[model samples]
Structure formats: C-alpha cells, structure tokens
Target: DDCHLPLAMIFTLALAYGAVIILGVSGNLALIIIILKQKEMRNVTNILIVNLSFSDLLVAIMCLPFTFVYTLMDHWVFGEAMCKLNPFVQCVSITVSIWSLVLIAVERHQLIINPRGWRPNNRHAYVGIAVIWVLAVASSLPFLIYQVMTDEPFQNVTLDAYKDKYVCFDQFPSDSHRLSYTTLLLVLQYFGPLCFIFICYFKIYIRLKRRNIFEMLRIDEGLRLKIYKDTEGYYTIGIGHLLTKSPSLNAAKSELDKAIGRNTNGVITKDEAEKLFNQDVDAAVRGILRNAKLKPVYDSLDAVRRAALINMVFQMGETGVAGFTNSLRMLQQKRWDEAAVNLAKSRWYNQTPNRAKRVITTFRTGTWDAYDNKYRSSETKRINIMLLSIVVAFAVCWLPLTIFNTVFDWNHQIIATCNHNLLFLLCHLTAMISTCVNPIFYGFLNKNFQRDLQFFFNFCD
Candidate 1:
C-alpha cells in the first residue's frame, strides 16, 4: 500500500505556504517599517500593534514551515518531541496573536471612550508583551503533555503508527477529556475571548456614536434642521430651509411633524430632525431614502475597519448572510427537510432565487451539487461570500481526509486511494488565500487611515 499522499496535493500545499509566507511577511514587514520610520506612527498604541505583527510573523516562521513539510508526507520526520510540541507551539502562537489584537482593540476603545481610565503606559509595552508570551506558553502546556504519538505495529514487516501506536493530540481516550479539551480551547482561544472582545467593541461603538449624536444635538438644537419647501403646482418639493419663516417650507415642516412625530425632546439633533423630516416629506422618497440608508454605513465604517488588518480574517454577517454553522448542523443531522429549510433561509438562497431554485431542484439527486453551489458560487448575492468561502475552504478541505482516515483504519493507503489528503491540501490552499485578502480591506475600508496616509505623504513632500 502507498504511504504517500497524492503528489498533486503536496505540491499545491507547498505553493500555498509559499504565498502565505511571502505575502504575510511582506505585508507585516512593510507595516512595521512604516511605524518605525514615521514619528507620528510611533505612538504607544502602535508599539503594541508592532508586537502583534511580530507574533504573527513568528507563527508563520515556526508553524508554517513545518506544516508545509508535514503536508508533503505524514511520516513525522520532525520526530516524537516535535509531535508533542508542534501543536502546543502552534496554539501558543495563534493564541498570542489573537489576544494581542484583542488588547489593541480594548486599548483603542479605552483611549477613545475613557481616556482617563487606568491604562497601560508606553513604558510597560515590553513588559506587557513578555507577559503575553508567558501566558501563551503556559496556556499551551496541557495540550503539549496531552499530545502523544506511540508505535503500533499492524503488519510483520511494515508498521502502522496510529494503528499500532495511538497518536492523538488535544484529547485523551475518554470522551469527557476530549470534550473538556475542546471546551477549554473554545473558551481560551475563541468563545470567552470572542464575547469579551465583541462586547468591548460594541459598547465602544455605541458610546462613540451616542456621544457624537448627542453633542451635535445639544450644540445645534433645532435651528439648523434642513427643511424642504413644496410650491403649489410643482412636481418636486424644493429642498429649502425650514427654520426660516418661509411659508412653504414651514408648512412642509409642519406636515413632517405629523408624519415623524414632533421632535419632542432636545435629544434629536437638527441633522437628525432634518433627516426624519426628509424621510417623511420628500416627494421623491426614493432619493431621500437612499441617502438615509447610506448614513448608517458611513457611521459604521470605522468600527469595521478596526476589525480588519490582523492575520485572522472575518466579516460580520449583515444584510441576511447565514454563516455555515447552521447549514452544517442541519447537514450533520441528516435532516434533509431541515437542511433544505436552513439552506433556503440563508441570505445566499434568499438573494439568489435563481441559484437557490436550481439547488432545490437537485435536492433529491444526492450529487452534493446543491451543497457545492450554496458554498462556492455565492458571490453577488447578499451573502458575505468571501467569508463563507474561507469557512468552507478551511473546514471542508481539512475534513475529508480526517473523516476517511477515521473510518477505514489509519493508513495512507486509504488517503491515497480516496485522494482525501490531496483534496484537503487544495482546500487548505483556498483557506490560506484569506490572508492575502486581509490587507486589501485596509486600503479599501479605512477612510480615516487613508486621510492619514495622504496627509503624511503631502507633509513628506
């Protein structure tokens, strides 16, 4: 039986790491360079950011090289010691990276929202980074000890390692232990941290937004509200000032009060009142509505940009995008009816009625084409297609081989026969492509950052 995976997959994984290393290192290095050379960018907060970049860079160097090699052939040439420490090192690196970003966000929020709060000063940055490293290493200890690879002989001449020797990481033989490890990681690596991070940012956004809104309201009161005047026999209501004694505009504003209710308290700003008024009285409601709709987007962009830039990539679900977690749940339960329902409910299906209809047509065929379509060609639909693509690329690509290996005994023969390892390698490549897409968002989404860049360039010239 062949011990090696299909060479095609091996080569593809190699190429992917090549790209990941080149792009990730180059992007992070350039960012670091900018921070170092520019005096303005050398803020205390950015020092933490440089540390974050350095961590990801180390992760790439330590983990990616070995992962690329291991994906080539699964014989553990890195040795038994490596097998124990590999997962631990990988976990520590990633965990540190995540916590660093989380720290940066929290610090930014504090600076903006609670500038007087007890905050870490510039003198403590190196100390803080050292603490983060120690904690990451400490957190990784259990997984390191738990990771075991032993020899198990299946045949007289050639031995099957996992078949003859139990080699498993992050879990013990007991289901309880396995579940505990999973739950622990979830808390340490994702769940607890996610809750804390999301709450911090959300509150920060709301605090900033409410502060901005209230400040505008208090300062302007009602005088500056935009008012529109409609002349008799005119098809269009002229966009005019209502605060003035212009009779037509006053009448328009009076009618707006009836429609949107009196702007009772001094709470609503002139700008907001004007917006509400326009929402009510603009004869061509479509144009007013379009501009009104874009207000939230403009308001929310800063929060979203803050979310980008780290090696980790994600997009929050909005406008009805259904993340694959729900779909995967339904699929696993073998509840076709429920699966179909879930798929249909997705933003993907809801937006692309034509494509959804096509998938529903093949629902009974069992070709998995419907599933593939829901995942792959989700572009142009309301779905966050890129995020969906990465999720699928990460899970599905790594999973096929894992499942195949589990079912038919631990042998590369099975992986070779099924070409599962090769398939996973390709999928992993697709997932790594997410790293490349992250830097693109910085250039595209960050208006404030763009302004900063332009001003800096002009100043330099």
Candidate 2:
C-alpha cells in the first residue's frame, strides 16, 4: 500500500510540476526574448533577469519531468546514472533560482528606493552566474548519494506494492541526516537568500525598475508593460490598439501625438519667426480692400482671430500680460462674471487701437517665467497622479501575495492539512495566473508595456 499509493500521488504532483514548468518556461522565455531582442530593454537590471531566466529554464527542463516521474513511481526507472544526476541537477537549479531571486529583490530594493539607482559592483553578472552554477552543483552532490531510486526489498511482490514503489529516494533519511538536509534546504536553499530578499525589501519598500516591460510578470510589484514604436512612421501596432483593440483610434491617436510632440519629439521655439502670418494677413487683407484679391481673404478674419486666441494669450504672457492672466484664470475656472470684470478692466482690447499696437504692447517682449509656470504646474500634477496610480496598483497586485505568504508561513507552525491545501492552491494559482495578469497590469500601470502588448495582439494584423 505504501509502495503504490504514493505513486498515484505523483499524478497530482505531475500536474503541479507541469504548472511550474509552464509558468517558468513561458514567463522566463518571454522575459529573456524581450530583454535580449528589445534595445530599450538592454540594461543592467534586465541583464539580471535574463540570467535568472536561464536558471529557471534549467529547472523546468531538468527537474519538472523527473519530478513527475519520481512522484508517480516509487521506483525511478531512469537507472543509477540518472539517479545520481537528477538530485544534483535539481537541487543546483533550485538553489541558483532562489539565490537569483534574492539578488533581484535586493537589487530592486536598492535601485527603486534610491534615486541614484544602485550601480553594479563592477562584477560581471555572467561571471556571477557561472560561479553560482559551480557552487550549487557542488553543494547538491550529497543529495545524489543520500537519495537513491534503488528498488525496495519486495517491490515486485504485488502490483499494489509495485505500482509506484519501484522508484525510491532518500525519502525519509535517518533522523539526524533528515534534520541536516532539512536545515540545508531550509537554510542554503531558502533561509539565507529569503532573508536577504526580505531584509532588502524591508529597509526600502517603494521601488520600481522604474521601467515597464509588457507581458512580463514580476512576483514583486515592479516593472511595467509598455508598447513603443520607431520615430519614423509607426508601422508597428502600439499599446492602445492591443488593450482596447481600436485600430482606427490608434492610428488617429498616433497622428495626433506626432503632431503635438507627444511622441517625445523635441520642440524649439524660434520667436514664432516674427509672425509671418501677420504680414501675410495684412498684405492679403490690403489687396482684398483694394479689389485686387478675393473677398474671402478679408472675410476669413473672424476665423483667423478666433483660431489665434490661445496664441494671443501666449504672446501676452511672454509680455507679462498680468491683466489677461487674471482674466484667464477666472475664465478657465468658469467664473465668467469675474473674467468679464477683469477683461473690462483692461479696456476690452480698446486700449490698443490696432493690431500693430497690440503686437508692440503685448507680443514683442518675451518672458519665459510667465506661462512656463502654468505648464510646469500641469506637468507636476500629472506626475503626482502617476505616482499615486502606481502606489494603488502596487497594493492591488502585491497585497494578496503578502497576505497569502504570511498565511503559508504560519502553516509551518500549525501544520494543518486544510491550511496546507489552501496555501498550496493559492501559491499555485498566484504563480500560474501571474503569467496572464502581467500584460494586463502592464497595460493599466505602464504605458510602455501597454504599447508592446497592444502591438503583439493588434499591430501584426
């Protein structure tokens, strides 16, 4: 009974391991690909993620299948050679992955909380990965000998006995040895690195890669999804279309952004080139008055004046147009009565008898401070809103896991099956669902990632 029932338990375990594999491979592969392929993603932090992906991929490849088989069968059919290799390989990968995670957490904590962004110690990550493998592989050697899949004395006596009992491990070692291995797994495999993770995070809680990569999952509340395109006419599908699936709106939005410099295009103001439109309008209006040009040219004055309202305000601000400043504030706040009061105080533009007089009095002098304050205020408000949005998202995404991890750790004290199952399923679900939720979260919190996910789904078509 002991021989066979445990083997059947492996069927369930296979599902677990399979999930681990799927999540590990899919998540890391995406990370690795995007990190390597996207020029924007090429940075030291991303480099760490790439190395972690390699380690996790190794775990998925070397451990998942073998684990499924071992749990399913009490007997490992892979023979002595694999029996020697499997535990070592699995343990090494596990150790490396955990350590890598710890390092990532520390790195993130330091970088996010500090404006300087934690710089690398000049140690090459590639070389560090190589060192990690050597040490992990070396340390896992004892497990190979300690746990073996040799057949039990009476494995073949009954099918029930042989069901999955054929494969064996260092399942329950001697009490002292068991304590030692548990300590090893608990400490070297988990404790030390986990302590580092928590310690770093504890000291400084708020951090971001300060960057976003769409569809990429982070167990920690960092990184965001972003979609991007070339400076040239964007043939690539962008983030808006991906999340919203509105291709027409995306195209229009793209054009609008380009026109307005929302595409991060630089703008250089050249004193409006002395308003050549003014001279042209005057010359054309004169020609029309003389019956030498079309009448429509003069008739369009109202439209031209209305269209130039904001420009006029801008010009006035540069000339320290304090009266208009007072008027506009009340105007924007919808205090029409007060706006009228202030505008009338300025003599309703009557004080300046002609356009030339207006230009001389209101537009010739330029002061950067006047209107720049309004724009800066708008930008600062936008940035504050963005930061608040980030904090709210952090609470939403990470609060669940923190509560669950606390509960899971508590189970170590209580040792209840119900709690165990709940914790197990929660962790499994969290880990697995993350793969899907990453892109969605990116879309919501990170413009860049949202862009990429948008392109992946919509741009290709």
Per-residue lDDT for 1-461 in model 1, tens only? 55555666556667767988898776666556667787765656567667656665665665567655655543446657777776687667556755765675566566545444455657766677788889889877876887776544233224554643333333356655655665576556755665666666657656554333322222222223334332333212212222334445445455545544665221334444445433323332233225443223223323222111000011112222223456435444545467567667766666657645444433323332433423222221212222223223323433443344334332323323336555555544543443443333333443434565567658888
On TM-score, the candidate that comes out on top is 1
Q: Tell me the TM-score of each prediction against the true structure.
A: 0.49, 0.44
Q: What are the runs in model 2 whose C-alpha is more than 4 Å off?
A: 2-23, 109-123, 153-166, 171-174, 206-447, 453-461
Error of 2 at 78 (Å): 3.6
| Best prediction by lDDT | 1
Root-mean-square deviation (CA) per prediction: 17.3, 19.7
Candidate 1 weakest lDDT stretch, 10 residues: 306-315
Q: Candidate 1 at residue 104, lDDT?
A: 59
Write model 2 residue lDDT over 1-461, tens digit each, in one string: 33223445445656765665675576667656766778856555456556656765665566546644553333566676776666576567556755555555555555544434355653666666677778777777777777666556333433563354345445435656655665666566655665566565545432221111110111111122233343333322221111123345466455435533445222212212112223333443354445422232224333222222323332232233334555545544545445445554565357443432332222222221222322432342333344333223323433454455445443433433434444544444343333333323324554555566566658669
User: Could you tell me how far off, in angstroms, the CA of residue 106 lies in candidate 1 after the best superposition?
Assistant: 1.6
The lDDT, on a scale of 0 to 1, for candidate 2 is 0.45
